[PDB]
């Protein structure tokens with residue numbers, strides 16, 4: 001049900017620019033065939049709601065074969081097609097297109113001559129466009145067919161960016177000690193690693209221009225012509241360019257466009273604002289955004305001195321290299337780190353201001369003879385604790401991979417004999433794991449790799465409860481407490497991904513709305529969704545409010561904690577959602593927020609996902625929220641009152 005509830009179908013239906021341009025392209029394509037005195041037979045691969053096939057019949061198509069692999073959506077399409085009056089000219093086929101056949105016992109009577117698809121993701125080819133088009137041309141469509149879109153072009157732009165490069169590399173981490181400044185350096189293999197072999201998809205329009213320096217023009221790397229045989233074979237494309245500035249080549253930004261017609265008059269583009277002529281004409285969507293790729297190593301370029309950028313791809317994946325000045329399987333992570341820390345986590349560890357804030361917290365609670373246990377996955381806190389004068393430091397790493405990575409970091413920093421790594425689930429550690437000692441300081445960020453919602457990091461509190469018997473009398477916990485906070489917001493655009501459409505370009509899509517509604521209301525309580533709100537502008541309509549408080553210095557209570565209240569809407573706007581986040585009381589006079597950092601538009605901690613509870617799809621919002629200690633779940637309802 002959750003796959004349906006949080007699918008991208010609703011966003012597509014609200015994507016006005018997408019739907020307008022497809023409709024224009026489809027009318028032109030169908031007319032080109034009819035004007036030749038020929039039968040117009042449409043193959044619509046990945047039909048979803050059936051929208052593009054319905055467009056095709058209004059344009060004059062004789063018949064459409066609409067293919068949809070996902071059974072619940074194929075069933076929806078059948079109903080939607082019927083509601084809109086097109087059942088006589090559209091056959092919905094619930095198969096993957098590569099299983100579709102032409103023949104007396106087949107799905108199609110003959111090859112089609114108009115090929116419509118919307119099989120694209122942010123990387124263009126990451127959801128199988130190439131092998132799908134390849135098979136279609138081989139078996140399902142005529143030579144010289146019309147295609148909508150007619151072609152796609154992938155673009156790339158080389159930049160220097162400390163912020164985005166910090167999602168890929170570990171920078172030196174500084175800490176001030178009694179003896180002076182200490183530095184934590186990365187293992188050399190991290191410095192030499194090509195990184196994780198996966199795109200980083202983001203709303204690139206929300207990255208400040210101050211965060212990167214453009215080093216190249218926007219380069220058209222390669223194009224795919226959907227009207228002719230498409231190949232899914234590996235390929236590489238080398239494009240020469242003259243650097244626009246001197247700097248460190250680090251990051252390749254990328255996006256694509258599609259042309260709906262042979263003449264290229266009708267275009268949809270994912271280019272970010274600085275690569276378009278007018279930011280006021282920018283079109284928002286979420287189902288397609290932009291790409292961030294990393295070069296396998298950084299290196300200098302010089303303004304005016306030509307180089308060649310190379311786009312590599314296989315049947316699903318794209319990656320980049322900078323050709324040698326003189327002068328292929330995709331490289332994989334050989335340093336462990338990129339398999340364990342995701343891109344935002346890299347950025348978080350590299351936030352020196354954040355690190356300094358934890359350092360000052362530790363200075364406050366690090367008493368003489370402190371015996372520290374550190375609990376948080378892949379955390380550098382154990383190293384800060386040592387450098388700041390802990391008598392003995394233990395840390396827990398519950399996976400063998402993370403255990404090895406942290407030991408490696410400790411060893412290259414000559415701390416192998418100062419920090420003991422315990423390879424167990426933290427709640428299961430033993431007296432002997434602590435060498436028979438009692439813990440006087442239990443510390444954490446808290447951060448755990450598996451946490452998906454902000455309150456999942458309350459696992460730290462669970463661990464605190466489980467290891468109580470290993471704590472010294474008067475033991476201190478850092479953070480000493482945590483709290484759940486909420487604010488009501490109006491989203492600029494994000495509301496589109498969960499709002500009903502009703503009518504799309506004249507077609508009745510209420511059945512799609514009903515289907516989504518049924519899935520997100522399956523449970524008695526609707527769940528909040530995690531989103532990185534630094535990528536999604538919104539403004540507050542209420543004051544922020546503390547919802548629940550958790551005293552880490554004490555064990556978790558065995559009864560559920562419930563809170564009820566009201567949040568006054570103090571500013572005008574549409575109440576799209578309640579946004580929730582965690583704050584941590586590190587010490588009596590130190591706090592940190594993983595959500596709102598300007599309690600204009602909201603400003604959000606860029607390292608963390610916030611939780612969004614969308615409201616029913618009016619100047620007070622009431623809430624009921626409950627924390628369940630057996631599971632760690634938090635259930636909630638927010639409603640206008």
Ligand SMILES: Nc1ncnc2c1ncn2[C@@H]1O[C@H](CSCC[C@H](N)C(=O)O)[C@@H](O)[C@H]1O
Nearest residue numbers: 046047048051067068069070096097118132
């Ligand atoms: N090779 C394939 N054969 C059949 N369905 C496919 C497919 N590849 C992807 N899909 C389906 O293609 C759809 C892509 S979303 C596009 C939906 C629709 N054409 C529209 O534009 O409104 C999804 O529902 C997915 O399940």
Ligand SMILES: C[N+](C)(CCCS(=O)(=O)[O-])Cc1ccccc1
Nearest residue numbers: 448450458459462629630631632
């Ligand atoms: C769900 N638990 C059993 C722990 C499991 C968390 S894990 O996914 O990090 O393994 C109980 C729990 C209890 C209180 C807080 C948080 C979790």
Ligand SMILES: [Zn+2]
Nearest residue numbers: 193333335338
């Ligand atoms: Zn790596």
